[PDB]
Amino acid sequence: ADTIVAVELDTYPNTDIGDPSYPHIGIDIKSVRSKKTAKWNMQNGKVGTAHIIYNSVDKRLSAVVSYPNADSATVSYDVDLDNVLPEWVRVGLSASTGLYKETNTILSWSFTSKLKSNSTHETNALHFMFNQFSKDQKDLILQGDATTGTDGNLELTRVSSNGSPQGSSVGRALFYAPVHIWESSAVVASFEATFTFLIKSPDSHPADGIAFFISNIDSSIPSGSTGRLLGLFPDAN
Amino acid sequence: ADTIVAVELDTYPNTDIGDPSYPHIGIDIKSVRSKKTAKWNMQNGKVGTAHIIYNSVDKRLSAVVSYPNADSATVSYDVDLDNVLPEWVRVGLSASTGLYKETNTILSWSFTSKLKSNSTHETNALHFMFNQFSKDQKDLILQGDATTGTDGNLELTRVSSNGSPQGSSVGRALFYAPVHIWESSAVVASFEATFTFLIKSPDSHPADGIAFFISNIDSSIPSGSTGRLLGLFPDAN
Amino acid sequence: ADTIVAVELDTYPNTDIGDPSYPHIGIDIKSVRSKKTAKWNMQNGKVGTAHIIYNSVDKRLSAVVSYPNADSATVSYDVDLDNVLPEWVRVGLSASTGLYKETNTILSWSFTSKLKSNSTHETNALHFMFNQFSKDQKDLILQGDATTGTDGNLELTRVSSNGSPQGSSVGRALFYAPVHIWESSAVVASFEATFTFLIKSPDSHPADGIAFFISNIDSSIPSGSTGRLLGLFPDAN
Amino acid sequence: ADTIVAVELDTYPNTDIGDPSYPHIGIDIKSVRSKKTAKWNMQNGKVGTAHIIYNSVDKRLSAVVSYPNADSATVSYDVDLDNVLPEWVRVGLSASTGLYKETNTILSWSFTSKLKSNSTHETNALHFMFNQFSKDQKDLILQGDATTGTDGNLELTRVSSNGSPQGSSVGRALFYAPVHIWESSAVVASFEATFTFLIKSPDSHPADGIAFFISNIDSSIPSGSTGRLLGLFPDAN
Ligand SMILES: O=C(NCCO[C@H]1O[C@H](CO)[C@@H](O)[C@H](O)[C@@H]1O)c1ccc(-n2cc[n+](-c3ccc(C(=O)NCCO[C@H]4O[C@H](CO)[C@@H](O)[C@H](O)[C@@H]4O)cc3)c2)cc1
Ligand SMILES: O=C(NCCO[C@H]1O[C@H](CO)[C@@H](O)[C@H](O)[C@@H]1O)c1ccc(-n2cc[n+](-c3ccc(C(=O)NCCO[C@H]4O[C@H](CO)[C@@H](O)[C@H](O)[C@@H]4O)cc3)c2)cc1
Ligand SMILES: [Ca+2]
Numbered sequence: 039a040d041t042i043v044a045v046e047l048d049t050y051p052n053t054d055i056g057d058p059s060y061p062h063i064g065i066d067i068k069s070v071r072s073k074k075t076a077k078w079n080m081q082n083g084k085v086g087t088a089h090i091i092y093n094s095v096d097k098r099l100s101a102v103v104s105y106p107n108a109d110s111a112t113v114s115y116d117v118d119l120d121n122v123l124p125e126w127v128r129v130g131l132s133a134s135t136g137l138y139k140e141t142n143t144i145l146s147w148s149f150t151s152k153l154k155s156n157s158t159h160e161t162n163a164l165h166f167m168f169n170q171f172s173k174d175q176k177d178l179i180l181q182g183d184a185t186t187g188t189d190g191n192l193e194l195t196r197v198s199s200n201g202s203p204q205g206s207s208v209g210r211a212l213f214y215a216p217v218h219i220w221e222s223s224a225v226v227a228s229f230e231a232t233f234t235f236l237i238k239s240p241d242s243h244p245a246d247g248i249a250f251f252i253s254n255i256d257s258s259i260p261s262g263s264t265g266r267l268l269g270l271f272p273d274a275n
Numbered sequence: 276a277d278t279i280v281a282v283e284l285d286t287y288p289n290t291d292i293g294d295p296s297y298p299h300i301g302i303d304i305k306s307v308r309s310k311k312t313a314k315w316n317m318q319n320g321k322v323g324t325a326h327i328i329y330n331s332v333d334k335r336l337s338a339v340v341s342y343p344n345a346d347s348a349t350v351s352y353d354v355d356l357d358n359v360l361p362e363w364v365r366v367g368l369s370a371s372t373g374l375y376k377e378t379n380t381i382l383s384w385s386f387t388s389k390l391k392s393n394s395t396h397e398t399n400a401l402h403f404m405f406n407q408f409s410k411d412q413k414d415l416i417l418q419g420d421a422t423t424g425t426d427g428n429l430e431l432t433r434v435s436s437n438g439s440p441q442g443s444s445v446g447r448a449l450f451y452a453p454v455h456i457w458e459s460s461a462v463v464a465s466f467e468a469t470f471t472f473l474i475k476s477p478d479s480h481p482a483d484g485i486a487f488f489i490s491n492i493d494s495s496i497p498s499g500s501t502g503r504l505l506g507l508f509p510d511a512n
Numbered sequence: 513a514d515t516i517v518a519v520e521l522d523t524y525p526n527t528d529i530g531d532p533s534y535p536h537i538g539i540d541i542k543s544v545r546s547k548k549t550a551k552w553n554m555q556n557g558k559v560g561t562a563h564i565i566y567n568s569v570d571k572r573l574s575a576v577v578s579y580p581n582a583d584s585a586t587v588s589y590d591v592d593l594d595n596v597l598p599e600w601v602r603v604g605l606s607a608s609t610g611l612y613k614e615t616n617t618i619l620s621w622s623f624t625s626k627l628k629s630n631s632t633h634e635t636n637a638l639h640f641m642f643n644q645f646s647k648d649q650k651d652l653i654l655q656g657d658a659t660t661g662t663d664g665n666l667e668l669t670r671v672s673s674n675g676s677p678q679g680s681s682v683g684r685a686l687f688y689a690p691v692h693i694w695e696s697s698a699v700v701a702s703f704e705a706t707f708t709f710l711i712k713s714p715d716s717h718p719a720d721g722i723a724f725f726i727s728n729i730d731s732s733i734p735s736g737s738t739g740r741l742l743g744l745f746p747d748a749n
Numbered sequence: 750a751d752t753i754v755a756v757e758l759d760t761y762p763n764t765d766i767g768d769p770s771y772p773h774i775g776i777d778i779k780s781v782r783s784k785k786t787a788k789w790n791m792q793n794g795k796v797g798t799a800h801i802i803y804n805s806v807d808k809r810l811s812a813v814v815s816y817p818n819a820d821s822a823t824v825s826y827d828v829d830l831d832n833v834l835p836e837w838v839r840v841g842l843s844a845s846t847g848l849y850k851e852t853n854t855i856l857s858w859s860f861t862s863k864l865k866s867n868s869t870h871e872t873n874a875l876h877f878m879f880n881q882f883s884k885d886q887k888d889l890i891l892q893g894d895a896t897t898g899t900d901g902n903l904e905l906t907r908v909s910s911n912g913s914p915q916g917s918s919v920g921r922a923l924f925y926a927p928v929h930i931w932e933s934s935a936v937v938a939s940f941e942a943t944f945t946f947l948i949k950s951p952d953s954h955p956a957d958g959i960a961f962f963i964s965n966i967d968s969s970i971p972s973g974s975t976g977r978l979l980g981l982f983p984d985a986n
């Protein structure tokens with residue numbers, strides 16, 4: 039299977055597979071059963087912001103999700119990603135719907151990665167920023183139901199023309215370029231990601247959520263990963 | 276054929292195809308016959324620096340090449356790259372040898388591109404920096420004789436183990452990711468590139484040179500583009 | 513006498529001192545009498561964006577002023593700013609009202625300066641970005657009527673409690689830190705400034721405008737520089 | 750009394766005031782008595798690199814000091830710098846000599862500060878980079894014996910014409926511009942500093958070291974702060 043490190047914005051409580059009873063954010067290391075979760079007052083129809091950060095000095099993967107004029111939710115897990123991920127990865131956005139549904143709209147995505155060497159004492163670096171997405175976005179790999187160009191936004195899951203989200207949808211977008219995420223010969227490896235999202239449900243209960251994820255370069259949507267598996271895992275182990 | 280916009284560091288005077296009699300730098304728009312050239316005191320065995328810049332306001336493509344403690348050489352050509360390049364390109368380094376030869380060593384390469392929109396008044400951006408190159412550089416597309424990992428440097432053309440450059444060599448390295456270089460809906464499109472290079476000849480006459488180039492995403496070394504064609508052109512037209 | 517290089521967004525034609533017959537943008541080298549202007553369809557009460565760029569390679573100062581879903585005004589002048597400016601400068605925003613008036617509201621301002629050279633592989637840089645201003649903004653020097661903190665915005669000129677601008681007002685905001693704007697020992701000196709503004713006038717005649725400027729470090733508002741002199745010049749020579 | 754947060758590269762063990770028995774690095778919160786230290790194999794006359802990082806999400810100040818081809822020393826402390834620092838600060842480098850001495854040479858210094866929030870999609874930032882210092886560096890406040898321009902290097906403490914460091918010397922360099930280091934209204938506050946240094950001692954006993962520090966804006970060298978107090982503290986409480 040793929041190797042997956044993910045930060046999940048999980049809108050739907052699957053309490054039979056370790057989810058708490060409320061919308062939550064979570065750090066996923068090779069399982070959909072988050073190693074750490076925190077409560078999250080997702081705001082239906084509002085534009086939200088996720089900030090993810092990692093450095094190799096702290097070995098702490100942290101996420102903060104906020105909306106204008108609200109308390110934030112933050113979650114942190116101590117993990118040494120040199121021991122979990124390959125050296126070269128891809129970075130991506132993933133979302134799903136199941137029996138219940140939501141728009142999984144991305145309005146912007148940025149990402150930075152840096153290696154500062156010990157062997158040569160010099161740095162390697164990648165930064166992208168999308169504030170608009172276009173109909174033909176040749177630096178994104180779109181998988182499953184994911185589309186671009188509707189209002190200059192990335193739609194991770196299937197929406198009708200009037201704007202109605204479909205169930206049993208799964209979708210991802212990956213940056214075209216492999217990223218050098220770690221190097222044993224380095225002093226400080228670090229990355230950050232930021233995206234803004236709009237999750238809108240006609241339902242009183244939306245599902246299933248959005249994740250930022252780091253994977254093997256060849257990662258693809260595992261089979262049957264709609265609903266609670268968020269396009270990231272083949273199963274709930 | 277490929278579409279090619281190139282800045283050439285041309286070490287060898289092919290006066291039968293429009294070259295001046297001395298080492299020169301040049302701006303190449305779809306031909307090896309530079310639209311503008313300037314004299315260049317290439318320093319055999321010294322680490323040099325090339326800076327290339329473009330913005331959509333000036334529509335001026337400029338290059339500056341310098342060595343520690345020397346006069347610079349600069350060249351500028353007014354060109355509207357929205358009228359020459361496709362919207363999506365790749366960026367790359369190219370070099371060649373022919374009857375005469377030189378190391379075409381790259382020690383570092385950086386690149387930045389930005390679109391600042393008029394439709395949405397928001398910006399898209401890509402930045403990479405290599406200060407080291409590794410043996411398995413998965414964000415570079417290596418073509419022809421190009422290799423990485425020898426001293427953490429990119430060797431564009433074939434060098435023996437003792438360090439002797441071979442003739443009739445051609446080589447390129449392209450950033451894995453397509454770049455959105457222009458957009459009619461934008462207010463300012465701009466890019467810059469920087470690389471450091473070491474060109475060393477045992478000869479009194481080195482050849483053939485190094486180029487930074489922008490091409491169609493699928494660009495490949497045209498056939499017979501060793502020597503004076505620098506890996507960029509199928510012919511000298 | 514201060515030394516002033518400025519880009520003027522000039523909302524009011526003073527035809528007696530060289531202004532064209534319409535709202536225009538202009539490059540001002542040591543004089544209110546623009547070396548170069550371009551027609552500008554200023555949009556009353558709409559948020560506009562200004563982009564200024566200079567590089568020492570083309571020795572070309574350019575500006576692009578734009579509004580969402582409109583044509584751009586752009587203006588350009590060939591000038592070598594080391595023949596005009598001292599090595600060390602402050603950067604700022606100025607505005608003024610006269611018999612006629614307008615809000616001179618700045619919602620955001622960013623600035624970048626680099627000196628790259630050939631000592632080895634290292635360069636010198638400064639960058640600030642204000643996307644909101646606060647009531648005590650200690651990295652800004654406010655002069656004349658300029659104030660900050662009202663809706664996180666810089667108000668260059670006097671505005672009453674109930675929203676309406678005052679006549680015979682003049683204000684400026686300077687970045688606290690001096691900027692190394694040129695060095696003789698550098699191969700490429702460059703800078704870039706961006707600001708978003710809201711110019712609102714109660715009636716069809718608004719005055720006098722906004723400028724981005726570069727001055728000597730101890731630059732201050734010259735006497736009698738309200739209205740047409742934009743807070744920048746003592747006289748209209 | 751100044752408010753001081755500091756990372757100390759401490760070359761001389763003052764065991765009477767809590768120093769460990771060996772050269773160490775240390776996180777100093779309002780006291781010379783480091784809250785946290787780590788062994789550090791200082792290399793006489795070799796160029797080292799210091800990396801400092803803080804983010805408001807982990808509330809974790811970390812430092813990594815390294816030399817080419819050697820193990821790193823790293824040190825980390827959980828501290829909320831809005832409970833310690835005022836909102837507005839200066840950043841600086843300090844060094845000192847006592848009965849014993851060393852060059853306190855800084856070859857380069859860079860610094861980055863960001864406040865991201867949720868007003869909409871905009872954030873506030875500062876960034877400077879010095880890769881060479883000049884004889885009149887107007888964006889630095891030099892204090893005590895600190896000087897610039899000798900081989901493009903910052904000399905924090907007194908060095909004679911013929912290369913040898915002086916005892917009972919103390920000097921500092923502050924960035925001219927105050928820094929907004931925390932805001933209550935922000936979701937992520939972060940900063941990062943990097944400097945390269947050359948510590949050369951004529952004999953086997955060198956003293957006293959270098960610190961990167963953050964202080965109140967009008968911070969100055971306290972009385973009698975040579976040697977073990979590193980230019981930072983009035984006393985060893
Ligand atoms: O709106 C203005 N100015 C614009 C507003 O400007 C402010 O606001 C602007 C916008 O905020 C800002 O840009 C500016 O910096 C400023 O603050 C303005 C208007 C009038 C002013 N002003 C002051 C005195 N006068 C006078 C006085 C006398 C005569 C006369 O006797 N005229 C008779 C006819 O003259 C003819 O017959 C005579 C006899 O045969 C001859 O002598 C003459 O040669 C001519 O043939 C005219 C004007 C005019 C001053 C400014
Ligand atoms: O190198 C130093 N310091 C290090 C250098 O430091 C500088 O340089 C460093 C490196 O640049 C820097 O870190 C520092 O901040 C500083 O600038 C240093 C060394 C000596 C100093 N100093 C000044 C006066 N004294 C005296 C005076 C008298 C006695 C005595 O009579 N000793 C007799 C034996 O004592 C015993 O018997 C007695 C009688 O029964 C009892 O009373 C006692 O209790 C004990 O049992 C000793 C010391 C010492 C001060 C500093
Ligand atoms: Ca769930």
Ligand SMILES: [Ca+2]
Pocket residue numbers: 285286287288289294483503
């Ligand atoms: Ca040639």
Ligand SMILES: [Ca+2]
Pocket residue numbers: 522523524525526531720740
């Ligand atoms: Ca005017």
Ligand SMILES: [Ca+2]
Pocket residue numbers: 759760761762763768957977
């Ligand atoms: Ca000590």
Ligand SMILES: [Mn+2]
Pocket residue numbers: 046048057062064070072
């Ligand atoms: Mn979950």
Ligand SMILES: [Mn+2]
Pocket residue numbers: 283285294299301307309
């Ligand atoms: Mn040529």
Ligand SMILES: [Mn+2]
Pocket residue numbers: 520522531532536538544546
């Ligand atoms: Mn004018």
Ligand SMILES: [Mn+2]
Pocket residue numbers: 757759768769773775781783
């Ligand atoms: Mn200590």
